[PDB]
Design a protein around this nucleic acid. Structure first.
Lengths: 159, 171, 103, 43, 115
RNA sequence: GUAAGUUUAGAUUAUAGCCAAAAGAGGGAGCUCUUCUGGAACGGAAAAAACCUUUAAUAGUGAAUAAUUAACAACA
């Protein structure tokens, strides 16, 4: 046995097993090959229903055709007017998906929805705790609301 | 995808049967896994009120192994409820009286202290030996690897391994 | 073998950064079970309702008593007897007549 | 405002096709065996 | 406390990356703890410094009076030296300024990822 | 660094804590006092007025964090 040779044993090796990653040059070729097929897939329109994740206000909304989204605040936009959401991080297809880093390019994805209704929130009861609470120490919250209907999701082969 | 609503609900909410081998396996590690399977925590859509628990089958409970001296040091305490009804039994004595009692007690204690625990115990099947009813095998969907890898004995070691192993010192 | 996860169970996963590098593309074509790894339909030539009726067999004293009936029901479904017991009128009336159902 | 009743809404999202790739079921991600042999089957 | 604590060493300069010459002009201080259950003098200093809100950015000069005041409240603040890679902002660019967490105040925001 | 302060005129109410933690004095345990400091969660320490993290309070099926009952036989 050569100098400083340690046979593998329970304590010689860690419980985890070391792995070797593939070489980059061939791996980069794999990256392009997948992209070329995907670009054809987008060009061929080989997809049906699509789902897109859109970040609006302080919330992330996964979206699909015919979806209805309620926003708990006013938008200042008249009902029946189509609007485009500008922050989309993910879109899905039948056999493929696109992931933003952290967002996709505006050219690749365009999403439009329409405002359906402007409404408020049903009363919410707020009552702080105090000795001798009494029944008249009550406050109601009717914060505004708005309704949005998803109209279209558009993608193009702009890879 | 594209399946009918009711069949999809039936499949998603269906209960699965699992088989566990207790030979030379610590019940505590098995109990932790058993609780996960019994309660239904092994599903991605687990919910507290969905009653998604799964059937667990445990065999070879007679041959379980306890680390350290837990066989003689671990004492189970129960009270009949009458004066002087306090009973203390060591783990070794309990195993001699009933091989399956220890496993059931550990699982019961690990399980949540709620009404659903009693129902979960019904779904649990404990067999002292390898014998199982055939219908259970048909119900059984998958078997789970033993939590603890069993060390080999000197006789179990292969002859080739002995040759490979060097002699540290010469007597 | 660029994918880091097995492709044999759910679907083949092909991970590829875009040329610009701004996007990560995942291609997930579904994989069907091999023919050799499936079992044939039962060759030998009964409705589940009949099986359910047979399971809750009426054998002793014609129809069995409520307790044994609950026990027989409990055994079949691996449930406790407490679940099967009825409830009083007070709570029964309280039950909502028109529960909402979405999707 | 619309004629729709103003009461608490359980879910702020309505979709008629929640699933596109199929809903998860227990058989998902479970590896098969040659001849579809069930566990412990000697064959 | 001995004054040696505030006398830096060459190793200390390397660790904190502060040049003994051309010392940084402005301190960045943010409150990260509560003044409740603290003596009155500590409470007064925080109010005087304007750090009423926690995690609130404040621009202050690296002068002895500020340095003396900051030392009193040292444990309740985080001190970072301000850096101006592009120099002081101009009047036209005053609306395009942006301060990064690294301590660099850019005078032009181009809305492009640093990557 | 910061925005209150002094004087003149009119006028009352409050003027009894609790516990923790320091400094003393009686003392020798522990107590008994005098003096200084802090406190009044919806979080945590098991439940926990008095300890720790906590600037007010608003809707949201968001996000980053603070304190946080656990800890790993001896001989040259």
């Amino acid at each position: 046995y050569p100098q400083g040779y340690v046979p593998k044993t329970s304590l010689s090796s860690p419980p985890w097993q070391e792995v070797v990653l593939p070489d980059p040059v061939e791996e980069t070729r794999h990256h392009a090959e997948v992209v070329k097929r995907v670009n054809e897939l987008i060009a061929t329109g080989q997809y049906g229903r699509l789902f897109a994740v859109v970040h609006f206000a302080s919330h992330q909304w996964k979206v699909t055709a015919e979806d209805l989204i309620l926003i708990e605040n006013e938008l200042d936009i008249k009902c029946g007017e189509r609007i485009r959401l500008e922050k989309v991080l993910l879109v899905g297809a039948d056999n493929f998906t696109l992931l933003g880093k952290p967002l996709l390019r505006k050219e690749l994805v365009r999403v439009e929805a329409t405002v359906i209704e402007k409404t408020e929130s049903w009363p919410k009861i707020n009552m702080k705790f105090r000795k001798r609470k009494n029944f008249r120490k009550k406050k109601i919250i009717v914060n505004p609301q708005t309704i949005l209907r998803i109209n279209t999701i558009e993608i193009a082969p702009r890879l | 995808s594209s399946f009918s609503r009711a069949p999809q609900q039936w499949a998603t909410f269906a209960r699965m049967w699992y088989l566990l081998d207790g030979k030379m396996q610590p019940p505590g590690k098995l109990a932790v896994i058993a609780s996960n399977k019994l309660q239904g925590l092994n599903k991605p859509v687990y919910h507290q009120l969905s009653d998604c628990g799964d059937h667990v089958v445990i065999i070879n409970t007679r041959h379980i192994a306890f680390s350290g001296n837990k066989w003689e040091q671990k004492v189970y305490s129960s009270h009949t409820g009458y004066p002087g009804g306090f009973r203390q039994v060591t783990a070794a004595q309990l195993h001699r009286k009933d091989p399956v009692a220890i496993v059931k007690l550990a699982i019961y204690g690990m399980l949540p202290k709620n009404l659903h625990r009693r129902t979960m115990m019904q779904r649990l099947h404990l067999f002292p030996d390898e014998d199982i009813p055939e219908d259970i095998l048909k119900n059984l969907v998958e078997e789970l690897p033993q939590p603890r890898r069993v060390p080999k004995r000197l006789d179990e070691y292969t002859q080739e391994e002995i040759e490979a192993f060097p002699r540290v010192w010469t007597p | 073998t660029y994918s880091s996860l097995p492709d044999d169970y759910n679907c083949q996963v092909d991970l590829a950064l875009t040329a610009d590098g701004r996007t990560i593309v995942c291609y997930h074509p579904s994989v069907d079970i091999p023919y050799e790894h499936t079992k044939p339909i039962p060759q030998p030539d009964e409705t589940h309702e009949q099986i359910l009726k047979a399971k809750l067999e009426v054998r002793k004293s014609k129809q069995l008593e409520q307790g044994p009936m609950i026990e027989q029901l409990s055994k079949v479904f691996y449930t406790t007897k407490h679940r099967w017991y009825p409830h009083g009128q007070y709570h029964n009336r309280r039950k909502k007549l028109n529960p909402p159902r979405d999707r | 405002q619309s004629g729709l009743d103003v009461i608490r809404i359980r879910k702020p999202f309505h979709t008629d096709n929640p699933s596109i790739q199929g809903q998860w079921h227990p058989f998902t991600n479970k590896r098969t065996a040659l001849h579809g042999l069930r566990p412990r089957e000697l064959r | 406390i001995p004054d040696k604590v505030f006398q830096p060493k060459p190793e200390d300069h390397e660790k904190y990356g502060g040049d003994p010459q051309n010392p940084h002009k402005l301190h960045i201080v943010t409150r990260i703890r509560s003044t409740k259950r603290r003596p009155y003098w500590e409470k007064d200093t925080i109010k005087m410094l304007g750090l009423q809100k926690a995690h609130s950015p404040q621009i202050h000069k690296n002068i002895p009076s500020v340095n003396a005041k900051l030392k009193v409240v040292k444990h309740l603040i985080r001190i970072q030296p301000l850096k101006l890679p592009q120099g002081l902002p101009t009047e036209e660019t005053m609306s395009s300024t942006c301060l990064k967490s690294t301590g660099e105040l850019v005078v032009q925001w181009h809305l492009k990822p640093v990557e």
